[PDB]
Enzyme design. Structure first.
Site, PDB file in Angstrom:
ATOM      1  N   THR A 194      -6.851  -0.325 -93.841  1.00 18.64           N
ATOM      2  CA  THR A 194      -5.493  -0.321 -94.476  1.00 18.64           C
ATOM      3  C   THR A 194      -5.197  -0.102 -95.924  1.00 18.64           C
ATOM      4  O   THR A 194      -6.020  -0.367 -96.750  1.00 18.64           O
ATOM      5  CB  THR A 194      -4.986  -1.787 -94.398  1.00 18.64           C
ATOM      6  OG1 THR A 194      -4.961  -2.025 -93.092  1.00 18.64           O
ATOM      7  CG2 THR A 194      -3.566  -2.145 -94.848  1.00 18.64           C
ATOM      8  N   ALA A 203      -5.856  -8.196 -88.111  1.00 20.01           N
ATOM      9  CA  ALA A 203      -4.521  -7.928 -87.571  1.00 20.01           C
ATOM     10  C   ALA A 203      -3.942  -9.169 -86.903  1.00 20.01           C
ATOM     11  O   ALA A 203      -2.807  -9.563 -87.175  1.00 20.01           O
ATOM     12  CB  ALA A 203      -4.577  -6.781 -86.572  1.00 20.01           C
TER      13      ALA A 203
HETATM   14  C1  LIG Z   1      -7.201  -1.281 -92.713  1.00 18.30           C
HETATM   15  C2  LIG Z   1      -7.359  -0.549 -91.382  1.00 18.30           C
HETATM   16  C3  LIG Z   1      -8.557  -1.916 -93.035  1.00 18.30           C
HETATM   17  O1  LIG Z   1      -9.636  -1.052 -92.737  1.00 18.30           O
HETATM   18  C4  LIG Z   1      -6.125  -2.459 -92.540  1.00 18.30           C
HETATM   19  O2  LIG Z   1      -6.492  -3.650 -93.158  1.00 18.30           O
HETATM   20  C5  LIG Z   1      -5.752  -2.888 -91.113  1.00 18.30           C
HETATM   21  C6  LIG Z   1      -4.592  -3.891 -91.188  1.00 18.30           C
HETATM   22  C7  LIG Z   1      -3.870  -4.084 -90.014  1.00 18.30           C
HETATM   23  C8  LIG Z   1      -4.188  -3.483 -88.813  1.00 18.30           C
HETATM   24  C9  LIG Z   1      -3.387  -3.752 -87.715  1.00 18.30           C
HETATM   25  C10 LIG Z   1      -2.287  -4.601 -87.788  1.00 18.30           C
HETATM   26  C11 LIG Z   1      -1.963  -5.209 -88.981  1.00 18.30           C
HETATM   27  C12 LIG Z   1      -2.771  -4.937 -90.072  1.00 18.30           C
HETATM   28  N1  LIG Z   1      -6.799  -3.639 -90.454  1.00 18.30           N
HETATM   29  C13 LIG Z   1      -7.224  -3.301 -89.254  1.00 18.30           C
HETATM   30  O3  LIG Z   1      -6.804  -2.353 -88.635  1.00 18.30           O
HETATM   31  C14 LIG Z   1      -8.289  -4.177 -88.675  1.00 18.30           C
HETATM   32  C15 LIG Z   1      -9.695  -3.801 -89.154  1.00 18.30           C
HETATM   33  C16 LIG Z   1     -10.478  -5.108 -89.142  1.00 18.30           C
HETATM   34  C17 LIG Z   1     -10.920  -5.685 -88.044  1.00 18.30           C
HETATM   35  N2  LIG Z   1     -11.505  -6.804 -88.422  1.00 18.30           N
HETATM   36  C18 LIG Z   1     -11.412  -6.909 -89.741  1.00 18.30           C
HETATM   37  C19 LIG Z   1     -10.763  -5.850 -90.188  1.00 18.30           C
HETATM   38  C20 LIG Z   1     -10.527  -5.687 -91.471  1.00 18.30           C
HETATM   39  C21 LIG Z   1     -10.963  -6.634 -92.373  1.00 18.30           C
HETATM   40  C22 LIG Z   1     -11.645  -7.741 -91.912  1.00 18.30           C
HETATM   41  C23 LIG Z   1     -11.857  -7.849 -90.557  1.00 18.30           C
HETATM   42  N3  LIG Z   1      -8.225  -4.059 -87.237  1.00 18.30           N
HETATM   43  C24 LIG Z   1      -8.135  -5.137 -86.487  1.00 18.30           C
HETATM   44  O4  LIG Z   1      -8.082  -6.274 -86.938  1.00 18.30           O
HETATM   45  C25 LIG Z   1      -8.080  -4.913 -84.995  1.00 18.30           C
HETATM   46  C26 LIG Z   1      -8.151  -3.434 -84.590  1.00 18.30           C
HETATM   47  N4  LIG Z   1      -9.087  -5.767 -84.327  1.00 18.30           N
HETATM   48  C27 LIG Z   1     -10.186  -5.385 -83.672  1.00 18.30           C
HETATM   49  O5  LIG Z   1     -10.511  -4.215 -83.554  1.00 18.30           O
HETATM   50  C28 LIG Z   1     -10.940  -6.350 -83.115  1.00 18.30           C
HETATM   51  C29 LIG Z   1     -10.899  -7.649 -83.327  1.00 18.30           C
HETATM   52  C30 LIG Z   1      -9.946  -8.378 -84.232  1.00 18.30           C
HETATM   53  C31 LIG Z   1     -11.781  -8.276 -82.588  1.00 18.30           C
HETATM   54  C32 LIG Z   1     -12.425  -7.373 -81.867  1.00 18.30           C
HETATM   55  C33 LIG Z   1     -11.952  -6.113 -82.202  1.00 18.30           C
HETATM   56  C34 LIG Z   1     -13.361  -7.755 -81.013  1.00 18.30           C
HETATM   57  C35 LIG Z   1     -13.677  -9.092 -80.833  1.00 18.30           C
HETATM   58  C36 LIG Z   1     -12.993 -10.031 -81.573  1.00 18.30           C
HETATM   59  C37 LIG Z   1     -12.030  -9.567 -82.453  1.00 18.30           C
END
Ligand SMILES: *[C@@]([C])([C][O])[C@](*)(=O)[C]([C]C1=[C][C]=[C][C]=[C]1)[N]C(=O)[C]([C]C1=[C][N]C2=C1[C]=[C][C]=[C]2)[N]C(=O)[C]([C])[N]C(=O)C1=C([C])C2=C([C]1)[C]=[C][C]=[C]2
Ligand SMILES: [Mg+2]
Lengths: 250, 235, 240, 222, 195, 244, 231, 211
Positions: free
Chosen positions: H1, H49
């Site tokens: 993000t 997220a």
């Molecule tokens: C940028 C993409 C960062 O790279 C941005 O911060 C977005 C913010 C955001 C996304 C969606 C909604 C609101 C805000 N972040 C993401 O898209 C994150 C990337 C991420 C995952 N874990 C994490 C991230 C960033 C920083 C620290 C930790 N995407 C997610 O959070 C989603 C897509 N989650 C997952 O894919 C999974 C999670 C949570 C999870 C998975 C997959 C499996 C098992 C347990 C939890």
């Protein structure tokens, strides 16, 4: 179930009296006479072994009890209450002192701990006061010999000599005439036997009288040799024969 | 003495029945439900003229779509309002929607009988809970310390309740407008109040679908009082 | 734990323990609160049965809850300390969590809630205390004066009194205090507060305490001589 | 050391129409390189015109569905048989997932139904509760194979109108249920070819105002 | 956070604290005040792990402000420093310790003397004429050991501080974005707006 | 159930009084009189032991005057056992403060803490209150020499001179008469003993029936000394003031 | 008299007065009727209002798809007990994939009510319940009393003036038991039964409340114009 | 993000991308990273997220209760602090959040940065996320206080675009918000694919890219 008596059973009456404590003191008055006398080189505590039945072995019932090697106790009032207090007094001497400082508590502080237990039974929820008055005789290095009385209220007072129970009023008068600050231990034992004879009705001998002293260290009663500083207990319970010997010179 | 959760020989809980007597001593509160909205009105009843009457808060917001008027030991209502506000907002958290007026009332009434030897006694206050939702429309509920709640077209609680209820019996009909209901609450409050009704010792409020829950200004209520006087003098 | 229901309803719909707590307040020394145009004054009675008292160290009747709010009371003195302590803790807790000092209305609502809680909790009796809470909200110049009581109800007052002979001083305030034109200055506000206590107090010597609270955390307690000057002027005008 | 999680494979697909919604999933259940079942249902009718599928670790998926079905049951008891809207169900499911933030349900969840205006709705969840409404979503083992195909054939991405040459996009015309089921069947037939965990059978649940209808189609068993 | 300095002169205590807040490779702020007023004549600067620092500082501040109200009396800098130390010595054996190092600078109105206390996250207290936390003291102590007199004026203390800061800005690899300087004396606490 | 036997120790009377507190005060009125007098250069604590015996060991006895720390002492009036419970709590509280702030506890703060404990027993718990009234004599660098009293209600007040226990009405009148602000310790010692000598229920006031203590800045330079008088020292001060 | 202060006290004749007083609260409550055939089970309840502006208090509560009850007495106590039944029915489904037997549901209610009659501090439940259901052994009707006593019956009635309806069912026993595969006729018999307990007032559209469960019939409640058919 | 926000003369601008990532796989391209707490309060999402979504909705309820109790809208400072204290309980437990609480209160426009590490910082300009470093360059060079609403909205939009272009884990679309004293105003969803080419042509930037 659950103990739902979380409120006090001893309360102030309109006159300011704490009824249950007064009634506990009345139970002490009905109890068998016991006394204590302090000498220059020792303390003596004594009482009558009021046997409930001649078939009963009165040797098994101990009215005079060792609390520490240098502290002894005797009572007047309810025997069962005394027995549990002795158990708690023995334990508290270890938990609140010996396990901390590595030595037995001085008389006044052990008395203070016993007093605290008796005060709590006077204020805590769902309990009655202990129906006993204790006489605690003892010795320690910095305070010397001492004799304390402890009442159902938890109040305690140091005495040169005193008596509690059935014939205490007469016995205290007898002690006032005989007591002085130059008494040797043998003189105090003699006075104790004279005082106690007045309150006893029936047989008066070593088998019906219980008497113990706090005096000189008894290395023969220690149970081991090799450590010079450990010289043995000052508490000693007089035997049936030892009492009878002093009744001939009475 | 005797248990707090004790039944009488007639099959009623002593403490619940005694709390109902405390509510009878409380200041009057009236509620009227219409198809255009629900109106809530209360008697403030200041104990002294030095008491700043605007600080008397006997009509209270629970959510944007739910209001509440009280009568009895008003201090007891604060924890009930707190629970109601929490319940309303918590449901919005869990379900992304407004909570049904009936469900909110049921949540408040669940607290009622949680007393014994939990709180030490029942609540000494009755509540008129008014609101709107999409399923059952405009609603008015009467929540008691017995844990029971009745829905009402119109309802009065407090010291002048039985006199006011008889008046509401005759006056209420299904085609009442909001303006008509406002004047009707003022009319009946003026009838049962000890002191003379004005904008300072009485308070109006309503709940509509569009604007939500609103407590009326003293200037707005004053005009409705003046409008009432003229229409009574008209015949 | 001790769970006994002490505050309960009676057949006529009364909670006697709460009503008997009001009798304890009736016994307490008189306390009065008057708000002017730009200030609030808290007056308190000191019973002169107790002389040989050390006035330096004796607990004062008016207590600061924060730098901008004060609390006086009538009733059981020991009970009042518990409410004051709780209020002081909450005042700091509010500053700590919300980064603003409490409003006078909020602090009153908290104290009143504590009092109410002790009227329907097991194993406890109500507080035998009514309080007068006065002060100024942060960044506001409108005076605030609230009252609480054992039942837990609270309300705002232009002027109010509590405690013994409060019926008399309230009578005085009702005819002397004008809402359309309140005490414009500090002098006028203090004078009216002293006048009201002189209806009940007895002697105007060390029996009257006065505490003036002004906006922006400006709180000061008047001395014996300063109060004595008010007592002198009032009676000299009265001789006519 | 004991591993409390597993991978049961499978792939699911939800597409939202103008007045309908589909939720499809293969019926194969696996561990490692073995097949457990060729027909083990993965998409369920949960009540109130809502369908649901929790794909990943089957034990966690079964538990979540079981809990949500239970949540629907108690929503009726507590709120006078009120119908649970799809948006309200989604929010409820978020709280079911986050209640185990520190020991998650290892599943990717998709629900489908109709919104309060009668339009088709699909919601997708991450294992810890982050949810979003979408028009098109594939989840599970072969999600990365299918989603780009849906971007192209459902939302007409990277597609422009001939003659203009990249100046004017292809317009977003809605799809019918018959056209959608074709995309679903082609999606799963393609995924079955290139993913070893996908095959055996395909079960589709279609949601309209009239109710929940089922369709089953065989897939390759290799 | 990075650098916190303290120096006790004749009639005051001077605290200098860096302005930078950093998360990874980015400077989030360049005007951060790493200090809380515990009482009118007692100031505490702090540095350590994010969150822990401000949470601990404001927790201490609330406790001292509570004491002040309850007693209508300002605690001595020595009493405050002992309270703070106990809280940190309690914290170090807890489940998750506060990772905070502090300097407490106060003017004791009873003794009419300035006082400076250095306390690290373990609860290690020491009263000093001058002190620092972290890698700060490593560069500055040689200059302070050389130039410091107990009879220095406030203006002389500030000049010696400028010298200490100039050395940090030359030899430290990290850019801490200058310092906020505060003086604690008999008249209370004030900030030097130009440094 | 158990409700049947509950005395309800923490309730109001119809008049707004606490039954048990009032009855506890009645108990205290039969206790030995204790007097505190504050002077410009120190404080005096005097107290009467109740009908003693010749066989009581006086030199090792303590029923009235107790030491809380080096700067603060208390005179007791009421149940001794109840007082010792509170005294030990106060001793711990003083040490907690010293450990926390590295300064000796201010007198008022210690007094407030004990008074708050007493208050608690009147408002909750269903237990009887402590049948004890204290006179606190102490010194700190804020207010200097201070006298306080607390009673079972948990209410405390400051005093220049005060008495608790038996005959306080008579004792307070005598103190109010002869006390002056510019008074010194030696004069205050004389006032305390003269007041006890006139209010006592005993035939004559002797050394064996008294406990006495002073808190003086009469220690070498700026510091405070506590003196718990010995039996022989009480005998000497009785002769000096001209009572025996 | 001296033995009615709490539930923990037997009287000299071995009676529990607090339980008997709780039983009295049921008699004050509005009438409700229960009856069943071999295929279906029916609840009929006369709802009570506060006044003409007020609504009519609901009497019937659904516990599961195959089970529910009608109440008479303290309504909040019925809410507590019905909530307990809902949970127990639900525990049986989630853990054992098994619909809770109506007989076992009665045993659970009995045991829950009993604990409140033997312990100090609490109080007995002030409500009577009529539980109907269809399980693996067919249709069932139960009567619950807050003393703890639960009884399986062909038909019954509780509440004020319930003796009239109970006598009618005792005569009609042989007829209504045979009404198999005909829900409307079984309800008719229930509506005719509850009518024997009416005085002054009659069955109106917002007064009457009916519920039914059966072989291929989930537990459903009928109110409003849905019961106008049976008036 | 990539998310950003900044205060200025006429309130506070709030902008964010819409990409969600699960490793190298692009899970979604339509995500909402701005959260509606109340008509005068916004919150940004970066990192986890689920974490960001759950706790900010929890905050919103907390803020609503505050309004009911106090008859007053919560301040930006108090709201940010409630969040900070809530997440501080779970410090070291694995939470991943980087948020900005943007609003207008009695003190004027307000903007606080709050993260799971424990930081809570007031500032006039913030950007958080993997693309924050690219966005800061455009902001810092073009940011003024005396900025028109039209120019301010473009700056926040252009700043996200810079990051969306360079950062692989940022892109999709740009969501814009403007917070005024009368409440927040949504200024649309802008696809980066279409926006990039438009900005390239009109501005002349991104010369190295061919189109
Ligand atoms: C940028 C993409 C960062 O790279 C941005 O911060 C977005 C913010 C955001 C996304 C969606 C909604 C609101 C805000 N972040 C993401 O898209 C994150 C990337 C991420 C995952 N874990 C994490 C991230 C960033 C920083 C620290 C930790 N995407 C997610 O959070 C989603 C897509 N989650 C997952 O894919 C999974 C999670 C949570 C999870 C998975 C997959 C499996 C098992 C347990 C939890
Ligand atoms: Mg395959």
């Amino acid at each position: 179930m659950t103990d739902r008596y979380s409120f006090s059973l001893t309360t102030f009456s309109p006159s300011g009296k704490l009824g249950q404590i007064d009634y506990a003191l009345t139970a002490v008055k009905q109890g068998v006479t016991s006394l204590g006398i302090k000498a220059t080189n020792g303390v003596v505590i004594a009482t009558e072994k009021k046997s409930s039945s001649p078939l009963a072995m009165s040797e098994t019932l101990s009215k005079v009890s060792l609390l520490t090697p240098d502290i002894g106790a005797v009572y007047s009032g309810m025997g069962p209450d005394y027995r549990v207090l002795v158990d708690k007094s023995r334990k508290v001497a270890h938990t609140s002192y010996k396990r901390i400082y590595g030595e037995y508590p001085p008389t006044k502080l052990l008395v203070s701990e016993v007093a605290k237990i008796m005060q709590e039974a006077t204020q805590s929820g769902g309990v009655r006061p202990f129906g006993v008055s204790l006489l605690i005789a003892g010795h320690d290095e910095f305070n010397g010999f001492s004799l304390y009385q402890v009442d159902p209220s938890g109040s305690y007072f140091p005495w040169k000599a005193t008596a509690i129970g059935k014939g205490s009023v007469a016995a205290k008068t007898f002690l006032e005439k005989r007591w002085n600050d130059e008494l040797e231990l043998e003189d105090a034992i003699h006075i104790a036997l004279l005082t106690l004879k007045e309150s006893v009705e029936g047989e008066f001998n070593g088998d019906t009288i219980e008497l113990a002293i706090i005096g000189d260290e008894n290395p023969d009663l220690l149970g081991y040799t090799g450590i010079p500083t450990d010289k043995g207990p000052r508490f000693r319970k007089l035997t049936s024969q030892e009492i009878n010997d002093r009744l001939e010179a009475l | 003495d005797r248990g707090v959760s004790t039944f009488s020989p007639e099959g009623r809980l002593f403490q619940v029945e005694y709390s109902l007597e405390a509510i009878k001593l409380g200041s009057t509160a009236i509620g009227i439900a219409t198809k255009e909205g629900v109106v809530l009105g209360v008697e403030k009843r200041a104990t002294s003229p030095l008491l700043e009457s605007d600080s008397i808060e006997k009509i209270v917001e629970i959510d944007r779509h739910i209001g509440c008027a009280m009568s009895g030991l008003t201090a007891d209502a604060r924890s009930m309002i707190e629970h109601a506000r929490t319940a309303a907002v918590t449901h919005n958290l869990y379900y992304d929607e407004d909570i049904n007026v009936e469900s909110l009332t049921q949540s408040v009434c669940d607290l009622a009988l949680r007393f014994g030897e939990l709180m030490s006694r029942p609540f000494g206050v009755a509540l008129l809970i008014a609101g709107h939702d999409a399923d059952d429309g405009y609603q008015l509920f009467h929540a008691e310390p017995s844990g029971t709640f009745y829905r009402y077209n119109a309802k009065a609680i407090g010291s002048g309740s039985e006199g006011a209820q008889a008046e509401l019996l005759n006056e209420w009909h299904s085609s009442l407008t909001l303006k008509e209901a406002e004047l009707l609450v003022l009319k009946i409050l003026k009838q049962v109040m000890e002191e003379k009704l004005d904008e300072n010792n009485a308070q109006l409020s309503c709940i509509t679908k569009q604007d939500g829950f609103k407590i009326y200004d003293n200037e707005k209520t004053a005009e409705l009082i003046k409008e009432l006087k003229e229409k009574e003098a008209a015949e | 734990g001790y769970d006994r229901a002490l505050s309960i309803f009676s057949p006529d719909g009364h909670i006697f323990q709460v009503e008997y707590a009001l009798e304890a307040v009736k016994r307490g020394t008189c306390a009065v609160g008057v708000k002017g145009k730009n200030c609030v004054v808290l007056g308190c009675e000191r019973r002169s049965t107790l002389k040989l008292q050390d006035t330096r160290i004796t607990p004062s009747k008016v207590s600061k809850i924060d730098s901008h709010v004060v609390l006086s009371f009538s009733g059981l003195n020991a009970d009042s300390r518990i409410l004051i302590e709780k209020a002081r803790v909450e005042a700091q807790s509010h500053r700590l969590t919300l980064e603003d000092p409490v409003t006078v209305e909020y602090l009153t609502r908290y104290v009143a809630g504590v009092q109410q809680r002790y009227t329907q909790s097991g194993g406890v009796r109500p507080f035998g205390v009514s309080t007068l809470i006065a002060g100024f909200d942060p960044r506001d110049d409108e005076p605030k004066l609230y009252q609480t009581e054992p039942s837990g109800i609270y309300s705002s007052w232009s002027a109010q009194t509590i405690g013994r002979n409060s019926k008399t001083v309230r009578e005085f305030l009702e005819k002397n205090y004008d809402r359309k034109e309140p005490p414009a200055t500090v002098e006028e506000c203090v004078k009216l507060t002293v006048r009201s206590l002189l209806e009940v107090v007895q002697t105007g010597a060390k029996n009257i305490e006065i505490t003036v609270v002004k906006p922006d955390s400006d709180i000061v307690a008047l001395s014996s001589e300063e109060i004595n000057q008010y007592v002198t002027q009032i009676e000299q005008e009265k001789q006519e | 050391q004991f591993n409390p999680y597993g991978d049961n494979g499978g792939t699911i697909l939800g597409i939202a129409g103008e007045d309908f919604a589909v939720l499809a999933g293969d019926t194969r259940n696996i561990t490692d390189y073995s097949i457990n079942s060729r027909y083990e249902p993965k998409v369920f009718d949960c009540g109130d015109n809502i369908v649901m599928s929790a794909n990943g670790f089957a034990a966690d998926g079964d538990a979540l569905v079981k809990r949500f079905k239970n949540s629907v049951k108690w929503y009726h008891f507590d709120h006078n048989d009120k119908k649970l809207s799809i948006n309200s169900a989604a929010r409820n499911i978020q709280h079911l997932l986050y209640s185990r933030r520190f020991f998650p349900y290892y599943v990717y969840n998709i629900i489908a139904g109709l919104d309060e205006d009668g339009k088709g709705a699909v919601y997708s969840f991450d294992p810890v509760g982050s949810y979003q409404r979408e028009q098109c979503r594939a989840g599970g083992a072969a999600a990365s194979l299918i989603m780009p195909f849906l971007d192209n054939q459902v939302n007409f991405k990277n597609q422009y109108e001939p003659g203009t040459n990249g100046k004017v996009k292809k317009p977003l015309k809605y799809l019918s249920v018959e056209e959608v089921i074709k995309l679903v069947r082609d999606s799963f037939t393609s995924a079955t070819e290139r993913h070893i965990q996908v095959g055996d059978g395909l079960e589709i649940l279609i949601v309209t105002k009239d109710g929940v209808r089922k369709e089953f189609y065989e897939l390759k068993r290799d | 956070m990075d650098i916190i300095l303290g120096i006790r002169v004749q009639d005051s205590v001077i605290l200098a604290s860096s302005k930078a807040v950093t998360r990874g490779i980015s400077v989030l702020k360049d005007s951060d005040d790493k200090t809380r007023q515990l009482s009118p004549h007692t100031l505490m600067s702090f540095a350590g792990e994010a969150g822990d620092t401000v949470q601990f500082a404001e927790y201490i501040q609330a406790n001292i402000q509570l004491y002040s109200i309850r007693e209508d009396y300002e605690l001595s800098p020595q009493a405050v420093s002992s309270f703070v130390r106990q809280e940190l010595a309690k914290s170090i054996r807890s489940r998750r310790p506060y990772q905070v190092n502090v300097l407490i600078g106060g003017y004791d109105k009873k003794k009419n003397k300035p006082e400076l206390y250095q306390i690290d996250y373990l609860g290690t207290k020491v009263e000093l004429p001058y002190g620092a936390h972290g890698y700060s003291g490593f560069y500055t102590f040689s200059l302070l050991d050389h130039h410091y007199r107990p009879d220095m004026t406030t203006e002389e203390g500030l000049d010696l501080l400028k010298l200490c800061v100039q050395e940090l800005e030359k030899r430290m690899p990290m850019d801490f974005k200058g310092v906020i300087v505060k003086i604690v004396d008999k008249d209370g606490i004030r900030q030097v707006d130009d440094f | 159930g158990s409700r049947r036997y509950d005395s309800r120790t923490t309730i109001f009377s119809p008049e707004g009084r606490l039954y048990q507190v009032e009855y506890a005060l009645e108990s205290i009125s039969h206790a030995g009189t204790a007097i505190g007098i504050m002077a410009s250069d120190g404080i005096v604590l005097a107290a009467e032991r109740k009908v003693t015996s010749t066989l009581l060991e006086q030199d090792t006895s303590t029923e009235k005057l107790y030491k809380l720390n080096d700067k603060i002492a208390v005179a007791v009036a009421g149940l001794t056992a109840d007082a010792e419970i509170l005294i030990n709590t106060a001793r711990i509280h003083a040490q907690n403060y010293l450990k926390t702030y590295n300064e000796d506890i201010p007198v008022e703060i210690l007094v407030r803490r004990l008074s708050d404990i007493k208050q608690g027993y009147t408002q909750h718990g269903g237990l009887r209150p402590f049948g004890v009234s204290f006179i606190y004599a102490g010194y700190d660098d804020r207010y200097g020499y201070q006298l306080y009293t607390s009673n079972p209600s948990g209410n405390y007040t400051g005093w220049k001179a005060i008495s608790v226990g038996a005959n306080t009405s008579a004792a307070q009148t005598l103190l109010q008469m002869d006390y002056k602000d510019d008074m010194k310790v030696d004069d205050a010692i004389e006032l305390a003993l003269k007041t006890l000598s006139k209010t006592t229920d005993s035939s004559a006031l002797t050394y064996d029936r008294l406990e006495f203590a002073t808190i003086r800045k009469g220690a070498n330079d700026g510091e405070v000394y506590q003196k718990i008088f010995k039996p022989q020292e009480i005998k000497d001060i009785l002769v000096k003031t001209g009572i025996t | 008299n001296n033995y009615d202060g709490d539930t923990v006290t037997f009287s000299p004749t071995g009676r529990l007065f607090q339980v008997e007083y709780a039983l009295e609260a049921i008699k004050q409550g509005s009438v409700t009727v229960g009856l069943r055939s071999n295929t279906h089970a029916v609840l009929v309840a006369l709802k009570r209002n506060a006044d003409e502006l007020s609504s009519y208090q609901k009497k019937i509560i659904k516990c599961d798809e195959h089970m529910g009850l009608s109440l008479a007495g303290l309504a909040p106590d019925a809410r507590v007990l019905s909530n307990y039944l809902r949970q127990q029915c639900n525990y049986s489904s989630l853990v054992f994939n098994r619909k809770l037997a109506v007989e076992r549901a009665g045993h659970l209610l009995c045991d829950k009510a009993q604990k409140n009659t033997q312990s100090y501090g609490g109080r007995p439940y002030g409500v009577g319940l009529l539980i109907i259901g269809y399980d693996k052994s067919g249709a069932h009707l139960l009567e619950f009393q807050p003393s703890g006593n639960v009884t399986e019956l062909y038909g019954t009635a509780i509440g004020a003036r319930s003796q009239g309806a109970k006598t009618y069912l005792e005569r009609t026993l042989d007829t209504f038991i045979k009404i198999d595969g005909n829900p409307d006729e079984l309800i008719k018999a229930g509506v005719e039964a509850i009518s024997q307990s009416l005085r002054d007032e009659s069955l109106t559209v917002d007064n009457l409340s009916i519920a039914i469960v059966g072989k291929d019939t989930p537990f459903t409640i009928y109110d409003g114009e849905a019961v106008a058919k049976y008036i | 993000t990539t998310t950003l926000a900044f205060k200025f003369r006429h309130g506070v601008i709030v902008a964010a991308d819409s990409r969600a990532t699960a490793g190298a796989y692009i899970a979604s391209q339509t995500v909402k990273k701005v959260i509606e707490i109340n008509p005068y309060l916004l919150g940004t999402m970066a990192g986890g997220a689920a974490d960001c979504s759950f706790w900010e909705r929890l905050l919103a309820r907390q803020c609503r209760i505050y309004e009911l109790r106090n008859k007053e809208r919560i301040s930006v400072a108090a709201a940010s602090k409630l969040l900070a204290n809530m997440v501080y309980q779970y410090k070291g437990m694995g939470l991943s959040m980087g948020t900005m609480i943007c609003g207008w209160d009695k003190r004027g426009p307000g903007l606080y940065y709050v993260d799971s590490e424990g930081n809570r910082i007031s500032g006039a300009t913030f950007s958080v996320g993997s693309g924050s470093v690219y966005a800061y360059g455009v902001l810092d060079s073009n940011y003024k206080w005396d900025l028109s609403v039209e120019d301010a909205l473009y700056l926040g939009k252009r700043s996200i675009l810079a990051a969306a272009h360079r950062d692989a884990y940022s892109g999709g679309s740009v969501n814009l918000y403007h917070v005024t004293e009368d409440g927040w105003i949504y200024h649309g969803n802008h696809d980066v694919g279409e926006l990039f080419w438009k900005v390239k042509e009109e501005e002349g930037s991104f010369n190295n890219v061919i189109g």
